Design a protein around this ligand. Structure first.
Ligand SMILES: NC(=O)C1=CN([C@@H]2O[C@H](COP(=O)(O)OP(=O)(O)OC[C@H]3O[C@@H](n4cnc5c(N)ncnc54)[C@H](O)[C@@H]3O)[C@@H](O)[C@H]2O)C=CC1
Ligand SMILES: NC(=O)C1=CN([C@@H]2O[C@H](COP(=O)(O)OP(=O)(O)OC[C@H]3O[C@@H](n4cnc5c(N)ncnc54)[C@H](O)[C@@H]3O)[C@@H](O)[C@H]2O)C=CC1
Lengths: 326, 327
């Protein structure tokens, strides 16, 4: 039976990479058909028709059907996975608050729609920026969907961190395990080498260089989005779509034993992350359910960085509360 | 498995951007066969290419064993077993499709020589850049030490587009559609052949039962699909062209299903009255990196007319690149 998958922002950059991955089998593998439900805003519908034409022209055996629309209550109808990509990208004259203000209402409305018409088993992945806060907004506006069903994307941060570590250590990405991104999808994010493993050995022990971690690794990961913008002239697209795919796939199909991934999810207070925030944690997944990895010891350096990020998250929560978005 | 060395030219372009990430995540060889990407561009695009590689790196693809970038085809093609020649000017910005022949041909003269000098003995070469058939003809001719059967031009997009149209018309799913054939040139003279195609074990032309629909709607719709995409999106069909490039290479290397066949523009041995030595689209089955033209098909009158128009065009293009000294 085809999985009903809603994708918002389907005519934009990320969408133009993502839809073809989805329809070709990148999400659930070669034996699981997919129904795509694509949401856009009015002046993009024509372009969306174009995208659908290309989808048709790929002759994808797993693509059971495509519906397009501009009403979230039509498109989210009975969907089991909602990928909320639609939102404006970061502009050059924008402060973070500018983008937060620009995009939040989207998630108020979409959270309400999901609450009204989504399938009982729905999982909701939020890619549109600011990811964490937009997920908080959607979650809060869908009180009849379990709060655990909402996750903001920090998987791009996670994969970027894996890439940087792999490059530094001369290891293959398949040798890198238990990478963690803590907190916000922003320049305050904390990539944690202290619980990661490179080819079976503690990553911090392998790289043996605190000054590298602080001066090169962390800010290269944290500011990689900006670096991509500078090198390419626009924010990440194909890699954001790939990260969206990885996160949703792992969420639905489960994480490898002896590994974990980064997902921004609602905090119950674990690791001193304020309750109610959407914050990136190390998690394992099984049967569509995530579990925050337990028993980790948080060193003083890591604690300082994590707190910096959660402080930023709390500020964002206050800001959207003031705007009346939640 | 040891990483397959795959060259992709035009890597910083639109098709490239839609192609590389699917290649690196396993679309070509499946979940357990790593690949080494070797990416070729011209100098003004190298900076953009760096950005692309940044994104590739940021996907942390387990199958992507490594990436090399450069502008020297002798270096980038070194040891490759698959060369996907996507690099070439597209239509637009002062150029119509007919202008591409002279604009792009020399690329393939040069890359042909490069491949001849440095590619792995087992190399297969797929030409996407337009005009695809004639560019493949040029590449093949300038690589005399590589078997002629190793070169193929992409008609798989036409093929997939025709499958799409047929499935929509008949209310069938794409999995119902078998034995689609595109004959001839990847151009407006292409001939999508419903007479040998199947819709779930039924003759496709009979299922549609409407010769007027075939001639007046189906064929021109398939032919002009690129322009339709542009008119709708405001940008060209990069994702579906990338998808077709992947399909063709994948089926070439891994083989076609036993109940099916695909379209590939390959060198003609005179089969079906297609002048020898043209790179022309044929129905083919594939096994282990080799193609075989499907034999014994009865060519009806109408089909014959259309096929001959397309091969006539291909002959004129061959003559043109011969006059230009590209072969
Ligand atoms: N979390 C992450 O790792 C990353 C997040 N992003 C964010 O993802 C978002 C999308 O980025 P791009 O695709 O590059 O931008 P884009 O502008 O190319 O595409 C956004 C699309 O969303 C559509 N849209 C706007 N409002 C909508 C609504 N209410 N419902 C449905 N669709 C709507 C627009 O019409 C547009 O086509 C941006 O906010 C960007 O900052 C981007 C990269 C990485
Ligand atoms: N056979 C088919 O079904 C299709 C063929 N095409 C053709 O594919 C070609 C590429 O299309 P797009 O990606 O849309 O164009 P594009 O302009 O976005 O990209 C072309 C890229 O090729 C690069 N390039 C030029 N000369 C090169 C050389 N000697 N070596 C390496 N790279 C080189 C350019 O710098 C550019 O980055 C065009 O010729 C287009 O007409 C396009 C769609 C379908």
């Amino acid at each position: 039976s085809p999985l009903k998958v809603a994708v918002t922002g389907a005519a934009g950059q990320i969408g133009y990479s993502l839809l073809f991955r989805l329809a070709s089998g990148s999400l659930l593998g070669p034996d699981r058909p997919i129904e795509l439900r694509l949401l856009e805003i009015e002046p993009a519908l024509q372009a969306l028709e174009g995208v659908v034409m290309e989808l048709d022209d790929c002759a994808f055996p797993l693509l059971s059907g495509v519906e397009i629309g501009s009403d979230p209550q039509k498109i989210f109808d009975g969907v089991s996975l909602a990928l909320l990509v639609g939102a404006r990208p970061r502009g050059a004259g924008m402060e973070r608050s500018d983008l937060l203000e620009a995009n939040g209402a989207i998630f108020t409305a979409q959270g309400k729609a999901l609450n009204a018409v989504a399938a009982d088993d729905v999982r909701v992945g939020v890619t549109g920026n600011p990811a964490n806060t937009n997920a908080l907004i959607a979650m809060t506006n869908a009180p009849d969907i379990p709060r655990e069903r909402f996750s903001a994307l920090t998987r791009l941060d996670h994969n970027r961190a894996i890439s940087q570590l792999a490059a530094k250590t001369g290891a293959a990405v398949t040798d890198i395990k238990k990478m963690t991104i803590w907190g916000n999808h922003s320049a305050t994010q904390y990539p944690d080498l202290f619980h990661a493993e490179v080819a079976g050995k503690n990553a911090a022990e392998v790289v043996n260089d605190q000054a590298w971690i602080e001066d090169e690794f962390i800010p290269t990961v944290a500011k990689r989005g900006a670096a991509i913008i500078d090198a390419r002239g626009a924010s990440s697209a194909a890699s954001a779509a790939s990260a969206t795919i990885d996160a949703a796939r792992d969420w639905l199909l489960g994480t490898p034993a002896d590994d974990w991934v980064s997902m921004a999810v609602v905090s119950d207070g674990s690791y001193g992350v304020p309750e109610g925030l959407i914050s990136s944690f190390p998690v394992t997944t099984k049967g569509g359910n995530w579990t925050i990895v337990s028993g980790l010891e948080i060193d003083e350096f890591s604690r300082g960085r994590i707190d910096k990020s959660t402080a930023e998250l709390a500020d964002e929560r206050s800001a959207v509360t003031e705007l009346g978005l939640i």
